[PDB]
Amino acid sequence: ILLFLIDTSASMNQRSHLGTTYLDTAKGAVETFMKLRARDPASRGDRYMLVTFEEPPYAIKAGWKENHATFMNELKNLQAEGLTTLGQSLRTAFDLLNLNRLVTGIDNYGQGRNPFFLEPAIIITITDGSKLTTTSGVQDELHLPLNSPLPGSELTKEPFRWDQRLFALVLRLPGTMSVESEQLTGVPLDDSAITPMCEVTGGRSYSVCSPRMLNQCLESLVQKVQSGVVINFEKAGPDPSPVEDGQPDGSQPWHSCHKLIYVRVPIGHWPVPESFWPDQNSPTLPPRTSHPVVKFSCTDCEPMVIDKLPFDKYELEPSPLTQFILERKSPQTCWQVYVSNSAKYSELGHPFGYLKASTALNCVNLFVMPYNYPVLLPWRQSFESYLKTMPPYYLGPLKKAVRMMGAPNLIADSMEYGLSYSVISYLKKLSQQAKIESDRVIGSVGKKVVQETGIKVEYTGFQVALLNKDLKPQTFRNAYDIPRRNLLDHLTRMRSNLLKSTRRFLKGQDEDQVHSVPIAQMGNYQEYLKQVPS
């Protein structure tokens, strides 16, 4: 799923050095991105959406239940007229991407946080350089407005989601020559108000300066689409305890890269449950975070973990692997990882996995382990006392693995909270109704706005008409659509047309055809008694 955000604002009317405006260059770049992505044999399941800088009823051009034909037709007729309302457009796009999330089961907020339930989405937000306006002045903060929150959105406290990356294109093409071609293989950043918003999600922001640089950035962007598993790392709290082959001193601490969870839907178990201590009676649930604040500690702690535990291959995208490569990729050794923010009743973090590398030393495998592996792996009334340290709802998925061996547990203590189940079906129904109402009025514009609003300065109610583009005057049916110049000739033409008594008469003077004239479409409505047997 790819949602292209093209502003089509009035500031996108300035002409480049090639002769076309920035909007035409953006549309051409989108078309070349389409034809480049079509090369990879994986573009048979994705869906394209379009978002412009227009009113909430008119911002979306093609959303759910819209094929490629209507999407291309809407992107073709894009007009650059309006202000640069970036915040409202980003909010509308994020709400559109989060319409079918509370109904299928993604981010249920009650049963862990399953990383194998993915809904990838990439935003391009092709906008102008700077100087965004909000009908009052020029702002320099880019704060997303919060006026009408969706039902069930206060449990994340952030507009974007687990898998929602945000790339940006500014299209800073000069007007005279664009002769800046010193650095060949180098794509700098835009350094604008959208740069922090993009970096928070996990995607960079390109700075287009030349058509060659545009082609380079488009060819570099097609290689950044996969399953979205974005997790945040922190150096705390080990004081860079990497004393293995050298001495530490770094910027590879707050790594917020993605992870490629390739399927073999995705197959996996043992998710990151949450970051708080869930109580048995809690009417209000604390809001989750889109990026989990999980921290790693550099300790050997028996990296050899061999068992019949179901295996996972959530591949990690190499972005800050320099710190690992400095220590020879940690051969035959790993380092634990633990989620912060009160992972248990009374403690600060519980190691639930590690980041052991592969034998090929190519990337990090991201070995996800159970909540507390070094205890259950090595019954004398031990498991009954051990199952009290883990979160309650967490007994859900692990028991499935126990199904591979037997079934000692039951549904006696399989209860998260009596108040968490309530006020959940109503929120899901409200979200479904909102998604249906949004998908219903998605393409039907029905503007019907043509007036001059004649002010005084039949009274207080007059309004002069405006020039209608698609008027289609009926010359043979309506007599008012016949001007004075070609009146007598048109009169004789109408007379001859009425006195001819032909078959299948029409009221159009000369209606040649539409913009498209297909050969197969016209040849299908015919009959040819021939087969060419010879």
Binding site: T21, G28, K76, Q513, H515, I519
Partner: protein, 293 residues
């Protein structure tokens, strides 16, 4: 000197009108004369009404004879061809030979423009080079035709209001003064003002956009209106796309696509049309069908 050459031209025309090609020396002399004649013409040929503008022929001698039988004889009425009469046809050398003979015989009674198929890299991949190699044995007539195609004018200005051209508008061109200041004696490149003038296509896009053909851009209605308002024009005639009725109006009666090749590639089975413009700039769309063989 002049009377004998005129009689030889009439004999050549009468021979070509019976599905009979000329010899090597005759085609060479005809191409030379057309080169000395077309040298005086500019990029925007000032054509005067009344005329009868046609579209693509794509090497169809029978369809060309049908067009002549429909829209009057060649010496009687004026003609304005907008390219595409050399490729995608069984009889392609005969059509261009008859056209160039009528041009060198009636230089003030017929005008022909340059199309995207009048080049050296397109005729080799569509059959014209194969036809010239098969019929004439050698590959000298094809060389002469490709050397002559560089002298064909680009566009035409009818009555100072109608702007006829094969491809269409260009993003690097804003007025006719830029078109008049182009070196048409050059192979059609893959990019530039001439490539867009010979490879453009109209649509409801609005602005510009890359064309699916591989060369030229795609303009919209606002661009056509801006080009017609900034040059005093009232219409833009073109012939580059396949239509069904023969003539198609676009951009609020600003662009007129006139495809005068009936039964394109002998697989569509459509009609064709030409636009006869009278002395008072009154247009009449004369339609026709492929003649039976």
């Amino acid at each position: 000197d002049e009377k004998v050459f005129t009689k030889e031209l009439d004999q050549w025309i009468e021979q070509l009108n019976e599905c009979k090609q000329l010899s090597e020396s005759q085609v060479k002399s005809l191409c030379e004369k057309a080169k000395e004649i077309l040298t005086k013409e500019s990029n925007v040929q000032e054509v005067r009404c009344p005329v009868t503008v046609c579209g693509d022929v794509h090497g169809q001698f029978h369809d060309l004879m049908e067009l002549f039988r429909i829209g009057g004889k060649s010496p009687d009425t004026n003609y304005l061809f907008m390219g595409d009469y050399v490729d995608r046809g069984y009889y392609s050398v005969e059509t261009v030979t008859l056209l160039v003979a009528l041009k060198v015989r009636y230089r003030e009674r017929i005008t022909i423009l340059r199309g995207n198929h009048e080049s050296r890299q397109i005729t080799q991949v569509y059959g014209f080079y194969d036809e010239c190699l098969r019929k004439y044995g050698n590959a000298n007539v094809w060389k002469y035709f490709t050397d002559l195609f560089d002298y064909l004018p680009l566009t035409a200005l009818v009555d100072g209001q109608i702007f006829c051209l094969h491809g269409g508008l260009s993003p690097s061109i804003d007025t006719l003064d830029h078109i008049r200041a182009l070196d048409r004696l050059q192979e059609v490149p893959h990019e530039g003002p001439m490539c867009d003038l010979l490879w453009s296509d109209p649509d409801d896009r609005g602005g510009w956009g890359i064309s699916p053909r591989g060369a030229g851009y795609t303009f919209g209605q606002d661009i056509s209106e801006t080009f017609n308002h900034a040059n005093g024009l009232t219409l833009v005639s073109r012939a580059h796309q396949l239509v069904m009725e023969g003539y198609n109006w676009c951009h609020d009666r600003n662009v007129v696509t006139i495809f005068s090749a009936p039964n394109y590639c002998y697989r569509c089975g459509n009609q064709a049309a030409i636009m006869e413009l009278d002395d008072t700039l009154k247009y009449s769309f004369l339609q026709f069908d492929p003649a039976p063989r």
